[PDB]
């Protein structure tokens, strides 16, 4: 049906502006819907920011006290958010969401885009392989991992074997310290399959245009 997708810069300096785009497919933005911006803060906190509806009429939350502009480009089937004078309190996940004007039905949200408001520098991660100790490889399953350390801002993407290894994976929320994040992921496989079937963690950090594909090598002779 209708599908929405947010895009725009993930890192904004304090006192500047965030600018996001929502691209709508499967429906014309000039029909039936209100096109909303909503953001989410830690702690399950959602804030309605405003809409532009199918006829170009807008509305926004008074909480955003003259900082917000919601606009559209019908030739592109897109609508837009500008939020000026940002501070670290505007760090949030930003969603676009269409709801029908008539009844609030058919709510359809984008995937969300994290926007970090910070003066800290973009930094590419180091990706380190976590190979199991020898003593831990003699059972029926074995666990391997990857440590993605020292990057900024979020997010990174991490997959195993280009996404073909998805079961038995745990990817943990990143932890922030000194303006750099660290994330880990584990993968568990049947021990007799390793090292015969190799295992590689694939990490991408779009903010720094960096990718790392780290094959996990066993400890011991390789």
């Amino acid at each position: 049906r209708v599908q929405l997708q947010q895009s725009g810069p993930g890192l904004v300096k304090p006192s500047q502006s965030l600018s996001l785009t929502c691209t709508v497919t499967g429906y014309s933005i000039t029909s039936d819907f209100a096109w909303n911006w909503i953001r989410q803060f830690p702690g399950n906190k959602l804030e309605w920011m405003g809409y532009i509806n199918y006829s170009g009429f807008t509305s926004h939350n008074p909480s955003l006290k003259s900082r917000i502009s919601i606009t559209r480009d019908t030739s592109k089937n897109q609508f837009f958010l500008q939020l000026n004078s940002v501070t670290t309190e505007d760090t949030a996940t930003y969603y676009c969401a269409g709801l029908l004007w008539y009844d609030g039905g058919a709510g359809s949200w984008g995937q969300g885009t994290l926007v970090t408001v910070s003066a800290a520098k973009t930094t590419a991660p180091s990706v380190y392989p976590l190979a199991p100790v020898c003593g831990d490889t003699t059972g029926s399953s074995v666990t391997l991992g990857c440590l993605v350390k020292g990057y900024f801002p979020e997010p990174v993407t991490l997959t195993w074997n280009s996404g073909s290894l998805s079961s038995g994976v745990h990817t943990f929320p990143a932890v922030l310290q000194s303006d750099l994040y660290t994330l880990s992921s584990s993968v568990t496989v049947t021990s007799s399959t390793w090292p015969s079937q190799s295992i590689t963690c694939n990490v991408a950090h779009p903010a720094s245009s960096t990718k790392v594909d780290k094959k996990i090598e066993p400890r011991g002779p390789t």
Binding site: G104, G112, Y128, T143, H170, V175, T188
Partner: protein, 219 residues
């Protein structure tokens, strides 16, 4: 502004049992045309919120009929007739009748399952990281229930508290378990100074911790 108050804050439900959560609005949500702009949404871990109920009592497009909204005026209820593991996540209410539109604070649905001890795995610093000057030791405590757990690190048998950072997953709908990662970060020089590294997990499934260790420079 309209305040949307959800209760309970959290609920833990066995698969196949009903669930019921409440949303109370500070102002009536009926409008001048007979519509009540009250929606319920579910946000699964890692996803956006998604539609469930709208118009107070109506199933939204594509939503399983196990979800029912009831109520009127200021008091609303969402019921799940029989919970499934993929129902876990945070449920929100939302009102569209009074500007500015507002959301409830969320109710987190947890799936209750039998206790499960964690699977514990410890990993030395990579040779690549050791060329850097830093050294991280990682421990995974995976697929346990319930969610409370403790990890203790030891270096050469002495407890180490500085330099530990933990991260926890949300509940997994595949098996209704939790996992945790603990990382001990040292300088390379202090890592190379010491010999044995231990992660101890203590979980209500046992009185005795689960202990994983290695010696630096042994495979």
């Amino acid at each position: 502004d309209v305040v949307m108050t959800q209760s309970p804050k959290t609920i833990s439900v066995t698969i196949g049992q009903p669930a019921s959560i409440s949303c109370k609005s500070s102002q009536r949500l009926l409008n001048s045309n007979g519509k009540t702009f009250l929606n319920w949404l579910l946000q699964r871990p890692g996803q956006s919120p998604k539609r469930l109920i709208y118009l107070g009592t109506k199933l939204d497009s594509g939503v399983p009929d196990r979800f029912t909204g009831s109520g009127s005026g200021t008091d609303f209820t969402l019921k799940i007739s029989r919970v499934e593991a993929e129902d876990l996540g945070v449920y929100y209410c939302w009102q569209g009748t009074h500007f500015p539109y507002t959301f409830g604070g969320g109710t987190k649905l947890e799936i209750k399952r039998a206790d499960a001890a964690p699977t514990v795995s410890i990993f030395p610093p990579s040779s690549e990281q050791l060329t850097s000057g830093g050294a991280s030791v990682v421990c995974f405590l995976n697929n346990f229930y319930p969610k409370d757990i403790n990890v203790k690190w030891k270096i050469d048998g002495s407890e180490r508290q500085n330099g530990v950072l933990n991260s926890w997953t949300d509940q997994d709908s595949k098996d209704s378990t939790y996992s945790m990662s603990s990382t001990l970060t040292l300088t390379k020089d202090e890592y190379e100074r010491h010999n044995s590294y231990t992660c101890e997990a203590t979980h209500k499934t046992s009185t005795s911790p689960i202990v994983k260790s290695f010696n630096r420079n042994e495979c």
